[PDB]
Amino acid sequence: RRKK
Amino acid sequence: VYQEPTDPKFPQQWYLSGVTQRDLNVKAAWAQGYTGHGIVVSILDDGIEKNHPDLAGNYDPGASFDVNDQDPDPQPRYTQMNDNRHGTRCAGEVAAVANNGVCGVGVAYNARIGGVRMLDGEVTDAVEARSLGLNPNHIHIYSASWGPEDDGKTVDGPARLAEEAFFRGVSQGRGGLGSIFVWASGNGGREHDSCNCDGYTNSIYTLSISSATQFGNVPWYSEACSSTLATTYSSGNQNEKQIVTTDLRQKCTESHTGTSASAPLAAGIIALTLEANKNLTWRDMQHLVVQTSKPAHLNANDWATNGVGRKVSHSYGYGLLDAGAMVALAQNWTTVAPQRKCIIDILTEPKDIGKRLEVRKTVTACLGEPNHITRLEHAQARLTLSYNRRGDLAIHLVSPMGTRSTLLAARPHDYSADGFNDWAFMTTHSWDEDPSGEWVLEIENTSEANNYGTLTKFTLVLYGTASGSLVPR
Ligand SMILES: [Ca+2]
Ligand SMILES: [Ca+2]
Ligand SMILES: [Ca+2]
Ligand SMILES: [Cl-]
Ligand code: NA
Ligand code: NA
Ligand code: NA
């Protein structure tokens, strides 16, 4: 869902 | 007389200072006496090596938490691949200790630095909200070098808890002055991603920060959009230098890269600015960034002069941050008036998009009402539309002063048929303009395909004030  | 840091890698921090002028002018702020003392910054990432020899002296447990494991200790999870090094690299950019014979220095090398361990696990809405809302009367500045996937087909932003955290932060955080949220604008350049399709960067409550290479160019990973506010240096090609910071396992790295490195440098510069005037509001800080950022020698093909004479680019916002100018302008800054919000529903009927749609509307910007705006800050075009292939759309918005904001450029990989559901495309490019007059929305099919859809809602949302303007640049 979220990425570095 | 100010003495610059003696740290062994400080000479390699080309972006902090130099005779060359290709820097963020940070030494000028240090020489004015601003190094970050008393300011608290938190890195929302995969953890922080709190015992790192270049972070321990500035580490602040009150700025830290482990949301992934629900404990106070944000120590990274160590693995053979050193996967969880990202937050430690970001933290050193802000607040690596100075004059201690180790690595380089942070921008705000006397500030207090914490980290929220929240990326090492499933990043839910609740996880984001607990991180953004951590200790908001102690943490001053939150830095986030993460976001929705940069595949160039995603449209996503904060869900309900995270958005509630943003509003709670800017309204009640920092003693009612408002939490400062700094965001990396994105790494989706290779996918032709648009940072307006990212609700975190597109938010008015975040300072979205883009990157420039050492030689002043738009890096390969850069995303262009109208919501970006300003720029800091980061990596480029292999002849260009990179960012020097603290690395996992108590090491030093000279090869920190990408959008991830730009937001922490901005957070450090904002920390210096807050030290120069602790009474600045979250909106004050954005005003300071707009007024002091420097376009000069950043190369872009889309530089445009807006209605108040400021150069603005979709790759760079208002340009490179200038720490010396920020701290100077902050010291005698007059707090901006309370924020007004003027909601203008534009459409009287749905409109077929076809090959090209142009919607023109003359507005009074709430003339005669308490939310009358003569001095724009952010503007949003909140659009609801259907379309068969979303990435073929290009969307532009023209202000009454003639400033053309690209709300959305073509996204070749975005095949979605889901359209936009009240998506609040934001532009910073008309900041300080008078928004009374004719606004123009343009929606066009950039492909030869016989695409089809309908615009069913266009709300123009204006934020700003009715006082305090400067003579245009
Ligand atoms: Ca832990
Ligand atoms: Ca050091
Ligand atoms: Ca993106
Ligand atoms: Cl609002
Ligand atoms: Na407030
Ligand atoms: Na933003
Ligand atoms: Na006008």
DSSP string, B43-89: EEES---TT-TTTGGGB-GGG-EETTTTBS--PPPP-TT-GGGHHHH
Q: Are B318 and B310 in contact (CB under 8 A)?
A: yes
Cβ separation of A1 and B46 shorter than 8 Å?
no
- Tell me the ligand closest to B222's alpha carbon: 3
Please name the fold of domain B334-465. Answer: Jelly Rolls (2.60.120)
Ligand 2: centre distance to CA B126 (Å)? 35
For chain B, the residue count is 473
User: Dihedral (C-alpha) B435, B436, B437, B438: value to the nearest 10 degrees?
Assistant: 40
Q: Are B313 and B302 in contact (CB under 8 A)?
A: yes
Ligand 1: centre distance to CA B77 (Å)? 8
Task: Transcribe B362-390 into DSSP letters.
Answer: EE-SSTTSTT--SEEEEEEEEEEEEESSG
Q: Is B86 a catalytic residue?
A: yes
Rounded to whole angstroms, how far apart are CA atoms B263 and B45? Answer: 12
Please name the fold of domain B7-331. Answer: Rossmann fold (3.40.50)
Q: Is B105 helix (H, G, I), strand (E, B) or coil?
A: coil
Q: Say which residue the tokens 């929220």 belong to.
A: B116
Active-site hit among B42, B60, B86, B194: B86
The enclosing H or E element of B117 equals: strand B112-117
Rounded to whole angstroms, how far apart are CA atoms B109 and B96? Answer: 5
Instruction: Out of B86, B123, B260, name the one closest to residue A2 (CB).
Output: B123
Q: Is B405 a catalytic residue?
A: no
Q: Say which residue the tokens 């700094």 belong to.
A: B182
Task: Transcribe B399-467 into DSSP letters.
Answer: -TTS-EEEEE---TT---S--EEEEEEEE-TTTT----EEEEEEEEE-SSS---EEEEEEEEEEEEESS
Q: Are B267 and B40 in contact (CB under 8 A)?
A: no
Instruction: Write out chain B residues lying below 8 Å of A4, CB-based.
Output: 45-46, 86, 119, 145-146, 260
- The torsion angles phi and psi of B178, rounded to 5 degrees, stand at 105, 125
Which residues touch B118 (CB under 8 Å, ≥6 apart)? Answer: B44, B45, B46, B67, B68, B127, B128, B130, B131
Q: Is B260 a catalytic residue?
A: yes
Q: Are B143 and B42 in contact (CB under 8 A)?
A: yes
Tokens of B301: 């093909």
For B260, other C-beta atoms within 10 Å of its C-beta total: 27
Sign (positive or negative) of CA dihedral B317, B320, B322, B325? negative
Cβ separation of B46 and A3 shorter than 8 Å?
no
Q: Which residues pair with B427 in a beta bridge?
A: B379
**What are the residue ranges of helices labelled H in B112-242?**
125-132, 160-172
Q: Which residue of A has its CA nearest to B47?
A: A4
Ligand 4: centre distance to CA B95 (Å)? 33
Active-site hit among B260, B313, B405, B436: B260
The amino acid at residue B165 is A
The enclosing H or E element of B29 equals: helix B26-31
Instruction: Write out chain A residues lying below 8 Å of B259, CB-based.
Output: none
Question: Which is nearest to B101 in space by CA: B1, B4, B3, B10?
Answer: B10
Q: Are B66 and B73 in contact (CB under 8 A)?
A: yes
Which residues touch B277 (CB under 8 Å, ≥6 apart)? Answer: B330, B331, B333
Which residues touch B181 (CB under 8 Å, ≥6 apart)? Answer: B132, B142, B144, B166, B169, B170, B203, B205, B206, B207, B282
Give the angle subtended at the CA of B399 by the CAs of B197 and B157, to the nearest 5°: 15
The shortest C-alpha distance from B179 to chain A (Å) reads 22
Instruction: Out of B122, B124, B149, name the one closest to residue A3 (CB).
Output: B149
Which residues touch B18 (CB under 8 Å, ≥6 apart)? Answer: none
Rounded to whole angstroms, how far apart are CA atoms B335 and B338? Answer: 9
B112-117/B40-45 β-pairing: parallel
CB-neighbour burial class of residue B391 (10 A; exposed 0-12, middle 13-18, buried 19+): buried
Instruction: Write out chain B residues lying below 8 Å of A2, CB-based.
Output: 119, 123, 128, 146-149
CB-neighbour burial class of residue B417 (10 A; exposed 0-12, middle 13-18, buried 19+): exposed
CA distances from residue B393 to B154, B230, B341, B442 in whole angstroms, order as listed: 14, 25, 28, 10
CA distances from residue B245 to B71, B105, B225, B433 in whole angstroms, order as listed: 26, 8, 28, 39
User: Where, residue-wise, is CATH 3.40.50.200 in chain B?
Assistant: 7-331
Taking ligand 1, which is a single-atom ion, which protein residues have CB atoms under 5 Å away?
B 66, 69, 71, 73
- Tell me B216's DSSP state: S
